[PDB]
Structures are given as C-alpha cells and as structure tokens.
Amino acid sequence: SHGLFKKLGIPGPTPLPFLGNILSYHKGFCMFDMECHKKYGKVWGFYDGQQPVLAITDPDMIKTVLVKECYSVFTNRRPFGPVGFMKSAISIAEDEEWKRLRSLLSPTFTSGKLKEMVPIIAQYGDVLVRNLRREAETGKPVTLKDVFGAYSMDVITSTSFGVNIDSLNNPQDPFVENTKKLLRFDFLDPFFLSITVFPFLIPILEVLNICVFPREVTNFLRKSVKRMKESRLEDTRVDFLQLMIDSQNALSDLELVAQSIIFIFAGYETTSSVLSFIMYELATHPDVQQKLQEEIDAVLPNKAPPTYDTVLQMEYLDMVVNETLRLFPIAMRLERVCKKDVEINGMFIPKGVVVMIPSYALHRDPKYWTEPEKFLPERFSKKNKDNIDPYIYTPFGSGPRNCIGMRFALMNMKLALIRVLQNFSFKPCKETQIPLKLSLGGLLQPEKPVVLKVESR
C-alpha cells in the first residue's frame, strides 16, 4: 500500500511502517496540510496508517469530485470508527441509503420554512441579550461558548422538534452537557489514534458494541428524542420532526433518532463555535465591530427587530461571517472516497483512495489570498467578491453532499449577531487568549474557551 503514490508519480512525505504519516499530525493536521502544500505543490499523497490519501488543490479537479462525479464515484465520506446505530445518520450513510435520507430531509429548510422560524428564533434572541446584559452589569469575563451554546441548543430543539428545553435558563441543562460529550475525537487519545491507524479494529469494536459516541450520551439522546416524538403524536408546524414522523407512516425508530442526533449536534456545537470565532474576531478588530454596528443601526434604526429580509440586506455582516469562516473553517478538510478507478483532469485515481481537499490550507494559500493570515472582511465585498474561486472557498462544502443546514445556520447566526451587536460591544480582557490557538482535536475548536468582556452600549 505504501508504494502507491510513489508508483503513480505523486509527491508526498515518506511513510513509516504501519503508521504511514500519522505522526505528522502531532502539531495538527492543518499545519501538516499547510507544510505539504508549500513543500509539494498542487497535489500530494500521504498515508493514514495503510489508507492512501490523495490531496488535491486544483479548482476544476475539486469541482469534478465534489460536483460532477459525486453520484458516480465520490459519493461517500471516509468511514471513521465504530458507529453502531449512527451508521444510519445521514452524514454517515452511503450510496442509496444516503440518497433517500437526503431527499427525505431536504424539504426541511425551504425558503418558506426558514421565514416561519424567524419569530421563533427571536424569542431566544431576546433571552440571549437579557443573559448577556447581566454579564455587562457585573462586568465579569464571559465564556462565549456557554451563553452562545445554550442559545444554539434552544434554537435547534425548538425549530426542529417544536420543544423548548429552555437551555438559556438552565446552565446544567442535560441536553448541552450530553451533546458536548458526543464526540471527543482526539489523536492524543489511544482509542481514536488506534482506530484511525488500524481500521481493521472497527469491525471488532462494532461486535463488542464499542462506539465512538459514548453509550451514556446516545442513550440520553435516544430517550430525549422519543419523548419529543411522543409529545407530537399525542397532541391535538411541519418541521424536521414531522417530516420524519410522516415517513414512518420507511424510517425506523432508531433511524429517526440518528438524524435527530446529527441535527442537534450541528445546531448546538457547530453553530456556537462559529459564533464564538466571529465574536473573537470582532473583539480584536474594533474598527470592524464598530463598522458592523453602524450597518446594523442603519438597517434597523433604534434596535428594531431583525426580519428575514433585513438579515439578507446586511452586506458587511455577511462579509464578516464569510471572512471568519475563511480563517476558522469548521471544514478543515473535505473528503470523498473514490469508489471506483477513474481519471480526472489528467490525473488517475485508484479505487479505495480517499480524495482530500485541504480547505484550511487552501483558505490561507498565498496564491489566492494577499495577507492570508489577516482578518480583512473587505475581500468579500461586492468589489473583490467575484475574484474568489467558488471551489477554493467552500466553508459549507459543495455538490450533492454539501451542508444541508447552510441557509438555516447563516440565518440563525446572523439573527444572534444582530441582536447582540445592537445592544453590546465585545472587548478582549485578561483571560482572552491572543493570539487564538486552535486545539489539535478532530473538530474545529480553540484550546482554551474564548473569553470576552461584554459592555452595554
């Protein structure tokens, strides 16, 4: 296996027996991707254990695997460990299975359904400002992840299940406590390092009922979803939950739970993380924060409530969101398994190979971005906008397998940002880590929580 890239004429770091190039992930795989792009150029290959991983950076080639040949050859993501029943979760499912889950869940975020959620989200936006104002009162340092996380949990559960768990008023909320423990992918943990280097273990762990997701956490989610499912079949809004309930009358019970777990995690974890990164960038760039507040005041004079339409009018807010996602992409890498031998744009790719798009590296690539390490919202303005390649910058992925919650995530975060900024200003304090350093974990997260001071306007 370790002689594949050598044989095909593809550059790459020399692999070690059994480990492949996995030890290079000691200072984060993003740095590894950066160094490989600089050292080897437009394409290179490395090995995760025995698994060949081909990294591509050419726009047209990226478009070919993410869009053109999605259903035909690059249909699924890389298997990543024992998943138990979560094998049915849409993001983990493959081929035809994934195809039906996709069409089934697709109606969830139509433009019409998104608009209906605005007032629902607003209730939580109001509680968010209230909680933050308390922090502004005491003047104590604020851990963004907690407050923004509770807001995110409340929003995803209400809009998806029509149930208000009121996380914004219950700090030890079991939903957040459990969800934040759902997946702690860490290469320093022997379990995750082992299954990544030796995939043959996966089948064995599945028999043993050993899962990457803690049994205690999934049990909790399973019970929680059942409860909410009941409250709906017993009471006298077509939402995520309804869509799945309707299918049952070919979706099985655990299967419905599997999708629910994906939505809860994405709505809570992924959303609150990006909000934290955005507020960090705003606190360390007062001119950007000041300028953003002015746009909001101009569009919504005297703290007027935001609306679906006015959210879309805010050009700078959108430039700020996009720029933060460029520097801190939750998708540090995008991947597709090559499920059959094929050539694309002049390059041959053997079956079984994992094709990887080093997003984090491409976003900081000194060919497409001047001053790549700088937070400059202007690069996304109408003027410079069209000069950004649609396949170099894909924070939500692209093609048939892209983020199904993209429009909801952008709308929800923007609603939060608006309410918060039309009431407060965030400033860095003593507990604020600057520069901000990312953890080496599998998911996009800073090493120490982002802490900031909130001041009332």
Ligand SMILES: CC(C)c1nc(CN(C)C(=O)N[C@H](C(=O)N[C@@H](Cc2ccccc2)C[C@H](O)[C@H](Cc2ccccc2)NC(=O)OCc2cncs2)C(C)C)cs1
């Ligand atoms: C060595 C290798 C295995 C590793 N790769 C990475 C980066 N890459 C490329 C990944 O595909 N990492 C994977 C991942 O994020 N997979 C994903 C889609 C994706 C791809 C790239 C960037 C962001 C989202 C999806 C995985 O099926 C998971 C599994 C899961 C279920 C419940 C709670 C947490 C996780 N599904 C979700 O996390 O959906 C949540 C979300 C929805 N939108 C953004 S995240 C895994 C490790 C789970 C980190 S470690």
Ligand code: HEM
């Ligand atoms: C700012 C927040 C978010 C970001 C940055 C984001 C980003 C991504 C990315 C990069 C992928 C991988 C796509 C690919 O491989 O091409 C993904 C997949 C997915 N996301 Fe998100 N996401 C976010 C929020 C959400 C939310 C809130 C939901 C749902 C409510 C959601 C549901 C999904 C699903 C189900 C998938 C898998 C799609 C499939 O396999 O068909 N995401 N997301």
